[PDB]
Symmetry: C5
Subunit: 307 residues, 5 copies
Amino acid sequence: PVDVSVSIFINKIYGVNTLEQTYKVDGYIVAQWTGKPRKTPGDKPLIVENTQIERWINNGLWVPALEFINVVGSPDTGNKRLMLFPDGRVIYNARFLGSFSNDMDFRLFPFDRQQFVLELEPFSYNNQQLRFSDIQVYTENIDNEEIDEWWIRGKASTHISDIRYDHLSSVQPNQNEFSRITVRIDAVRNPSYYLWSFILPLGLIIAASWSVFWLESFSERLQTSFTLMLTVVAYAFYTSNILPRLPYTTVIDQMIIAGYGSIFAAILLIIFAHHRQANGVEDDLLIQRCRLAFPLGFLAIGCVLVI
Amino acid sequence: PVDVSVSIFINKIYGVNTLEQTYKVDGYIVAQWTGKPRKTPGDKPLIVENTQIERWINNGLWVPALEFINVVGSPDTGNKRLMLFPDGRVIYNARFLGSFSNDMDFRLFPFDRQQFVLELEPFSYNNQQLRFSDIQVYTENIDNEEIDEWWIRGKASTHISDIRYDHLSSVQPNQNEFSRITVRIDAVRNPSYYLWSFILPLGLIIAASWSVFWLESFSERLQTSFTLMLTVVAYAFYTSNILPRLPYTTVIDQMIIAGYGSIFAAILLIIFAHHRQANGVEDDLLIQRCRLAFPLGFLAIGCVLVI
Amino acid sequence: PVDVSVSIFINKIYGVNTLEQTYKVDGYIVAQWTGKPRKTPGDKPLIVENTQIERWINNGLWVPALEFINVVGSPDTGNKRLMLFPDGRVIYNARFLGSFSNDMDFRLFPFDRQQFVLELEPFSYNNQQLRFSDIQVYTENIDNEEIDEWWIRGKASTHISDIRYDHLSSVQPNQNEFSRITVRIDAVRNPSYYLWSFILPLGLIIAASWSVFWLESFSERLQTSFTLMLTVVAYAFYTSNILPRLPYTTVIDQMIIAGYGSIFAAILLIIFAHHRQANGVEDDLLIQRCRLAFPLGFLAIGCVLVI
Amino acid sequence: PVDVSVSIFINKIYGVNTLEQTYKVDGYIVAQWTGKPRKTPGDKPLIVENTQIERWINNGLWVPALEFINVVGSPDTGNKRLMLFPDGRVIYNARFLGSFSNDMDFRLFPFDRQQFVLELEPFSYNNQQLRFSDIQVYTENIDNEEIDEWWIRGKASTHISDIRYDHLSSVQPNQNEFSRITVRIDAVRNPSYYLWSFILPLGLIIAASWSVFWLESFSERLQTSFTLMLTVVAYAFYTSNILPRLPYTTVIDQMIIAGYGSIFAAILLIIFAHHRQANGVEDDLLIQRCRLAFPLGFLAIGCVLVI
Amino acid sequence: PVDVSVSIFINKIYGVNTLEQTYKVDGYIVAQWTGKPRKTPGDKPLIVENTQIERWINNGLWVPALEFINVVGSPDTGNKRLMLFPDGRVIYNARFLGSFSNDMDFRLFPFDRQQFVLELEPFSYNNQQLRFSDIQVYTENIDNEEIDEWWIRGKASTHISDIRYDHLSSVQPNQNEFSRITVRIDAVRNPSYYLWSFILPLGLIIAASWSVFWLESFSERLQTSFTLMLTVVAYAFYTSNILPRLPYTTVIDQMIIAGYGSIFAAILLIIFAHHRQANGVEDDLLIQRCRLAFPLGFLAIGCVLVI
Ligand SMILES: CCCCCCCC/C=C/CCCCCCCC(=O)O[C@H](COC(=O)CCCCCCCCCCCCCCC)COP(=O)(O)OC[C@@H](O)CO
Ligand SMILES: CCCCCCCC/C=C/CCCCCCCC(=O)O[C@H](COC(=O)CCCCCCCCCCCCCCC)COP(=O)(O)OC[C@@H](O)CO
Ligand SMILES: CCCCCCCC/C=C/CCCCCCCC(=O)O[C@H](COC(=O)CCCCCCCCCCCCCCC)COP(=O)(O)OC[C@@H](O)CO
Ligand SMILES: CCCCCCCC/C=C/CCCCCCCC(=O)O[C@H](COC(=O)CCCCCCCCCCCCCCC)COP(=O)(O)OC[C@@H](O)CO
Ligand SMILES: CCCCCCCC/C=C/CCCCCCCC(=O)O[C@H](COC(=O)CCCCCCCCCCCCCCC)COP(=O)(O)OC[C@@H](O)CO
């Protein structure tokens, strides 16, 4: 098996689209192997640019096709270059733009922590014909940066493994195992914009919802409660386009559902207070003094939603 | 007829867009047949990569064109590979990305159950010239997964049939029947996000709409009813972009229309109560005690909308 | 002139985008003519697949280029095939996806009735060099179906005509007339979703707007009228993205403008009733008994907006 | 210099996107020049279709490349054709689809008046090597039509000029002047949809805002004013997506800002009336009789915003 | 090293998309170097158009590939041209459309000031094989213009530097340094549309929020405060799509958060005034005379948010 030595240079990560869990990676890939010696013009390496490589592949040069496994579409290959040396070794350099995809887990949404994965694999040659020796990843352009809201933490992890395929088992009986390269980059979401735009106003709205019990008139309490319900419905719409649509419940989601529960609890409490009159002559003191109990225990419910 | 043996490997299903009823499938297809024996370099199979196959087709190699019938556009074919054996058999491997389309029936919308269909067919050769022997489908990467809200249930069904075409009947009189492969995957929608985001708030709003009859003042009842109508109109907008636009009525749709009916029924009931005065001195007791009847029977109406 | 015999097979119509009045047609086109006899391998017809046809056109085969006149962009030609017979006749089969455009008249918008038109024409050869003999259209896959909200009614009309061009009159003096094929399919919009989503709620809102005159307090009437105006403004936004923007007035549009007129008429009537006091001691009876006149005549206005 | 005689045929103008000030033009271009005489098959002109022209350019035929200067992207060239005559003259016909751009001035927005410009220029040859003799424009398909809201008024103006370039001055010292063709089409916006959808409701809302002074209770006046402010905010959102975002102020914009000013003026006037009590015993007569002054002078302000 | 002399002509800058911080640049690039002398037809320079250059590169002409480093995608290269002179020098002219990206800092958002950067670099040749002599930038078409809201101030800065690469250090040990060209254009945002559309209405809403203390009834103050909170929530939605989502706080953002704080402060102040009764018989004078203190100090807070 011929030993290819990959080197990936990440130029920028951008376009992190949490709705579909894709992200666009731009960069360069440099593969390098050693073949039979050849005669080049002079004693110097020869550079073959894009759309000329095909004239060399037709004449019989061995250039393998490396593909990105987790790409959504096909990578927008820009320029490509092939450097041939007189001593025998070949270097294939190419520029890629891709929309890669990874399994993101938005369980802790504003305080999220994901990782961006590049998976690279030969398309045709198993590990008895092509083996990856090593990979370096030069992620120096995005070492400690803030792309839009993602801090790129630490270095980039690399790994070389062997993936066994089964749809090729009938056509390649006992040799259907392919060498694979994985590159992982840890990114932490910046929670500031959500903190001052989606959590502080919801906290103020929920506290104001608690503040309806200071009224001494029942009808005004009902109309006020419905106005607050309308405002919470406005935030129900206003948070819909932020993140995709998942079985479980995020942090902003808990605040929205807690706001709905607070509005409904206040409405039912004032209805029950209006119905609390046994003979219609008794007034209410203890159930309208929930201005200390209804907030505080609610905060404990918030603790249950946090931990 | 030459016997082709297809094998499809589904890599991921994603981008399930219910508005247009398309879905994107990414994967590999491996066709395989047997031709005349040939002399290859050594005693080993020969691999011909992408953009080299054309040099072999020009010289006279028989490679059929398989097409996907239910595709919206053209499949984004990435790499492709052709393995030729000395014993005679040929293997064509290719990678596809496609936006396929199927007839979806959103009658039970949050609790939906659809299936994703791949239909594959030769473009030029009828079943007297090309016949599909079998198909295996290796859907192991998405066996029991949750792509975004779709559980992929069970294995993948496969079928081989013969489709007879009529626009080719004048050009191919008695042989216009094409062999076809169908692949079906059963998927069940995950109803959780709609359950806690589109059904619980509508239930609370409808119950609060029932709660307007506890007021003892007519004008406040009217103004409260109009505020509730405004909130239900907000959810009328808020549910518009979820699913496409169909003649029949889904589950969230029934809740919205039931909310409109509840608001209008309450308005007409309080107007009729205000008009119920025969001489202007009589008050109302029985028609304002609908706080047990107006909810409960409405729930029975909900049963009619469920079953 | 050589006699081409076209046959079009419509596979599906979808993506009917009323904002730009385009629609996507997917299908196959089969042209067929007769040339000089030739020697094929054996006594059997010869099939030339895509990207091989060019080797036959370079050697001198006559294949005309048929274009779609009313296409927005260029048709996404998928596979194409060329069948050559020993007796002499040639058959060109191709698969197209196109975004076609037609002049749509949304005067009766929910109860609309449009037709989808395909116009096909040789690009280079006038009717002294290429003449269309006939066209069959095999629209059997969409014969009586419901694509999203369009019932496809009846069969597909076909027509063959001659279109005379003037920009080619200086370069082709007396022969600048091109044979053309037109295919028309009649489609009727399904009005159900608009009926239960855009007309019933507007009717309820307008009737509730009529219901403000039962109040006996002037200030509450004004505040109620402004709340109803806010709701009608919400539907003014909610109907904006449904259909494009036209000089005339559709059916939902009339309901929106009628709602605005009802709100303003009620406001002016209650202002005039408050000003109706000649000396400030007289009350109002007849002008507040418009609860029978203000609805009913409004319905007559609706008749004027219908017929 | 060789004399090219261009002839442009506009097929349709559509997709007029005022946000980016682009518009899509579809049509045909027919260039024509005279070269050396040649021998064609027979005594008849020879037609060379698309993807065959390259075989003639490789052998040495002179075909110039005409480009569109003001295009956003690259023109979607469909079919192209080359007619060669035995007497010597060559005719190049091509079909284009382009997204052209022009400097639009939306100062009078619903009653707008723009013009659509096509600029055509040789890419390589200056006017000492290629000169445009004349241009005809056959805009007969869109002569007096209504595309969506644009009336195409009159004929199409044409012009031939010489544009001098400076980045080519170092590489072409005294000959860097290129012949250019300009085509201008005058279009007038159809103001009807904005008239009945964005000006009549704003007029009704502003007049209703004037109508708050008829109330005799201060708190109800304040709450009514805030409800009207909420409605005007709804139209502030509802008008945002219509036209792009410009330093100056359009007609609908003036109505929105005037509505804000009316709400704030009414609020400040009722606050000042409540504070107008010198000793707390005096009531207000003259400042609450602004029901004739506050509308009328406002209309004069509208005149200032019109002229 | 061969000395290339680049000259860039910016035709238009448009599509400045602040959400992703890209901008589209359209223009021409003219590279020029000197090679060995050659024999051309006549004594005149020879022009080689697009799709003909490849026939010259195959025969052995040295044309380097210049790439744009900061491009999002691949530049839409339109026409390209190659002028070869008998004295020996070669001129490569090309037309580009690109979506370039730069690091934008929206700290002072309506009064912003960014710069647009073009970075150009050879793809294959280091500065021992290709060196940039100089660059001129002819930005005369956008010298002092207003594209949509960006004034292009002054001339265009140019710079030539050497960038050292590390992923090429293992394949090119001591020569991995590439010559680079940078072009910077200073642009200032036009703040007018935000001034009259996003700051004046927020100022009026905040001042009206201050105006709630003139009421003498507690329940009406609460309901009024909640209505104002609903309006501020409407502007919270209405400002979301203007600029991307950043850790820090812009100018409109400060106004929105200040509005929320004003609503909550007024609610807490009126609750504390209602609770201020020591025995329930005392009224409030000083804490309701904050109509001079609550605005004025708030303005000082605004100063803290400005400076
Ligand atoms: C003082 C009185 C208080 C008034 C009460 C006010 C009302 C307040 C809200 C109450 C309901 C609480 C619902 C909150 C939902 C909490 C959210 C939640 O449960 O999380 C997910 C389920 O979500 C969901 O099904 C959403 C469930 C919501 C559906 C509501 C059903 C509850 C019954 C309600 C009937 C009416 C009330 C009856 C009272 C008499 C589980 O994700 P899981 O980790 O498994 O990963 C998924 C896996 O697929 C990952 O691959
Ligand atoms: C106490 C008093 C109560 C107050 C009443 C409050 C008001 C409450 C709403 C009432 C109307 C109910 C409408 C609900 C509509 C239910 C939805 C429905 O019917 O389903 C679809 C029809 O939808 C539709 O046409 C929608 C129909 C709605 C149009 C409204 C017409 C009803 C008349 C209304 C005139 C005014 C009232 C008059 C009262 C005096 C049938 O799909 P189908 O399976 O065939 O597959 C289609 C096929 O093409 C698949 O290929
Ligand atoms: C009890 C008192 C009642 C209160 C009144 C309440 C208010 C209620 C609304 C009233 C205005 C009615 C406007 C309704 C507009 C009806 C819609 C309409 O007229 O249709 C189109 C014109 O639209 C339009 O210009 C829209 C016109 C609306 C502009 C408003 C101008 C009317 C004057 C208003 C000044 C203020 C009132 C003054 C009262 C003192 C004609 O398309 P047409 O077939 O030609 O094909 C086009 C061709 O280009 C196809 O190629
Ligand atoms: C009875 C009391 C009445 C209450 C008052 C109610 C409030 C009512 C509104 C008032 C403000 C009026 C603003 C209306 C703005 C009018 C719109 C306008 O002026 O047009 C553009 C400027 O826009 C703009 O800067 C918008 C300017 C608006 C910014 C507001 C500043 C005014 C000060 C406000 C401070 C608070 C008030 C203080 C009162 C004590 C000029 O384009 P120009 O042709 O140059 O081409 C551009 C070139 O770049 C083309 O290439
Ligand atoms: C009379 C009584 C008055 C009532 C009070 C009314 C309420 C009014 C609002 C108050 C909170 C103020 C928050 C305003 C936030 C100001 C905005 C701000 O601080 O700027 C950014 C932080 O944003 C942010 O974290 C947003 C922070 C907001 C989160 C809120 C936490 C504050 C605690 C609140 C708990 C409840 C109150 C408790 C009172 C008892 C810093 O960017 P920085 O330059 O570093 O570059 C980033 C780097 O990554 C660039 O690469």
